[PDB]
Write a structure and sequence with these properties.
0% helix, Conotoxin_a-typ_CS, little secondary structure, acetylcholine receptor inhibiting toxin, disulfide bond, toxin activity
């Protein structure tokens, strides 16, 4: 649950 570089370092899809 996180598909962008604006998520931080938890950008996992």
């Amino acid at each position: 649950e996180c598909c962008f570089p604006a998520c931080g370092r938890h950008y996992s899809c």
